[PDB]
Design a protein around this nucleic acid. Sequence first.
DNA 1: TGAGGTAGTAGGTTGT
RNA 2: ACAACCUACUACCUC
Length: 664
Amino acid sequence: LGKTEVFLNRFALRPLNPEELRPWRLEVVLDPPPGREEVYPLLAQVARRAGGVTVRMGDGLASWSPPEVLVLEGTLARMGQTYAYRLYPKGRRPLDPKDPGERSVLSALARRLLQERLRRLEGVWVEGLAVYRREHARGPGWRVLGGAVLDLWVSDSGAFLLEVDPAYRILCEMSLEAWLAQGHPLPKRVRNAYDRRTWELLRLGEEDPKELPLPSLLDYHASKGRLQGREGGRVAWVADPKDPRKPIPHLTGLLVPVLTLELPWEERRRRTREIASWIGRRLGLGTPEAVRAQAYRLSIPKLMGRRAVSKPADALRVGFYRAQETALALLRLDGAQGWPEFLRRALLRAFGASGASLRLHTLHAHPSQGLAFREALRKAKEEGVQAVLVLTPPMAWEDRNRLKALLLREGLPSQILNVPLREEERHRWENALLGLLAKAGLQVVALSGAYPAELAVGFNAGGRESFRFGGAACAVGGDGGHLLWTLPEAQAGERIPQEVVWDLLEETLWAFRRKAGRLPSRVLLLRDGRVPQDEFALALEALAREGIAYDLVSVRKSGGGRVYPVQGRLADGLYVPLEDKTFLLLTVHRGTPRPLKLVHEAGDTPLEALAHQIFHLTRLYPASGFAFPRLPAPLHLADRLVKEVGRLGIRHLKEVDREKLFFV
DNA sequence: TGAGGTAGTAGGTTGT
RNA sequence: ACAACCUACUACCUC
Ligand SMILES: [Mg+2]
Ligand SMILES: [Mg+2]
């Protein structure tokens, strides 16, 4: 559809000068010849110690300052060791904004120059490359500030670029004893005053600090120098952030509270244009010209119930895109008896429209019966039950998870619906109903349209603490197809192992080969952030050998900055090319919208096309009912799948149908 | 546990 | 330590 012009929260500034396009170069020289694994955290530390504006350039420094006015000789204490540096001038070296390699450096210096010129300005705050200008609260002990977070790089032409985005700080000005005595509840986070390590403040200790055995609190922390200039308070039984179970005593005097809980797009645009003007001139960088880019309102998707719909909730009266014969059991954990009538009517209305038939069972049993309860589950499944609705008061995480896993071990997904529930809460129970139905394995909605790819799979990592899970969900059938998940696999990090990516992918290829009678002509591959170097290498090879076409795309929930209209309102579905191989996509519009940032990593489909499918896949998600997810359904699904599997383990899923969206 | 979202604390992996 | 992404909490708003 239409073109448009939009404002990016970037601003063009002055060209770099003849001296800036040619930094001085320096050769570092450390005493304890550097460790092989420490040279980066440390070389970056020397660039800072050098003074002036100077960054790391390979294994030396690039400086925008003549060596004569740098601290070329110093010492350095990192992780306990004391290294002694010495900087040697190695003349100067021109850099080419054209060459993105040398441009990497010019933007490194740019960030320094930015933060170093923010440092010398009175009446503000500089927590990193961010500035806090107009204070926001007088407060009573605690001060919350206004301001903005900034960034500053170079460009192809060789000009500075200044990204700007409004922000806030929540700072404390007292002690864990002083602030808590000032009349406020106990904090969740609490950082040491003599260090930067943090703890999960659990409780207070009804024990004497002096006579308390330390596997003595009074004697141990005082014999470190902490007792000076301060007065340790009472025992504060804290617990590690890594090991959440084991407590460790500590003094409420040596602790500071890490306070936390305690803008509109019209306004945000404003505040951004202001902060940019000021900074532009107090910086000697010129008048801030608001960069503009061409946008494109993408063609709205055709959501299909049985008849077309605007929201998945509508399928509840129009009928489902593909309903089958389905049995749903009810489990109540409160005292009550049967299905609330309005819930019965509602399901029946929706199932009538769709055609096929509905059986409504009841589970007369309670988890408290132990194995008996499972046996009741086994019979429900036996009578064709597919999912269960659980009416109950709010469960606690631990009991919630136990229940969910319990039912899944008998292949019953389940939807929880909290029980103080009045019929006029239509939004709640309709969403619960949608959840119930997707968990049962129905396709509640689909898309009408032709797309480049007939198979779209999303890959996420991680729902766990120590290790994580790599998983994939997919929409199969280009048609605007039907949805399914695959068994996740545990992994050490964020990187999904190459063999796993392929294997998960092949499960979706096979799902396709079972629905249509062929291989897909082309798959769209979504990844949930950075694509770790070469992660899809093996997978993409295989797709070739098999004759399947593909497109890979990093989809990033952050980094896309902001997008404002030159005039009018922001529409749903703005596609905004940028540096080739990357574009923003503004898929939804609380306050100010955060656009996805997408990087076409591999494959030869045009950006607009990828941007078309992705935006549309945004509306495929069946469990949201009255609002769409910012993310394509395949990645939203995978995100959920990876979280549920981390909440409650992989062991339970062996007998659950990949077509039943149990994690929604 | 109805589901979306922005936005403020914290901390983790990949990468040079 | 820095970038790039990711994640957890909580608060707030919405149909
Ligand atoms: Mg992720
Ligand atoms: Mg759900």
